[PDB]
Amino acid sequence: KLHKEPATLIKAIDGDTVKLMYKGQPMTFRLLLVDTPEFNEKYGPEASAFTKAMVENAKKIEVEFDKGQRTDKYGRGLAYDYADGAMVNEALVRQGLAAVAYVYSGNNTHEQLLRAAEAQAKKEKLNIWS
Ligand SMILES: Cc1cn([C@H]2C[C@H](OP(=O)(O)O)[C@@H](COP(=O)(O)O)O2)c(=O)[nH]c1=O
Numbered sequence: 001k002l003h004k005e006p007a008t009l010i011k012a013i014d015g016d017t018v019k020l021m022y023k024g025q026p027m028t029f030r031l032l033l034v035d036t037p038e039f040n041e042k043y044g045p046e047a048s049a050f051t052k053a054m055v056e057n058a059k060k061i062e063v064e065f066d067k068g069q070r071t072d073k074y075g076r077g078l079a080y081d082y083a084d085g086a087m088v089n090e091a092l093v094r095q096g097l098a099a100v101a102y103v104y105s106g107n108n109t110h111e112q113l114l115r116a117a118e119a120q121a122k123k124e125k126l127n128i129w130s
């Protein structure tokens with residue numbers, strides 16, 4: 001299975017990207033399997049605020065790389081982020097602030113968990129699915 005690794009928050013960027021101090025060096029982390037609207041787009045500020053509150057108020061920050069590629073073409077770390085035990089990726093999808101997207105076979109461990117959260121967000125007509 002995968003493993004959670006500790007890290008510390010430098011600053012929240014937007015809905016699906018956060019700057020973290022990972023093993024002594026700053027790194028921008030892009031959330032796996034999700035896509036939040038840009039800050040300039042509808043639900044973008046809400047998505048940003050959500051992720052921002054989760055990571056800033058969190059005592060325990062953890063990153064969890066999947067079984068494949070760890071960085072993308074933009075130099076961003078690819079992982080699942082946890083704030084006090086709760087997965088940020090999943091929480092965003094459950095609230096309808098992020099759509100399940102960029103699902104690559106190499107990094108798809110929590111795919112079902114997230115698609116289940118998205119289907120429920122859809123049923124409740126939340127935010128992007130309203
Ligand atoms: C989430 C994720 C995104 N990406 C790339 C796909 C997209 O590239 P292209 O834009 O070149 O298509 C980009 C989407 O990022 P953003 O949603 O931050 O724009 O990041 C990965 O390569 N792997 C991943 O796991």
Ligand SMILES: [Ca+2]
Pocket residue numbers: 016035036037038
């Ligand atoms: Ca995005």
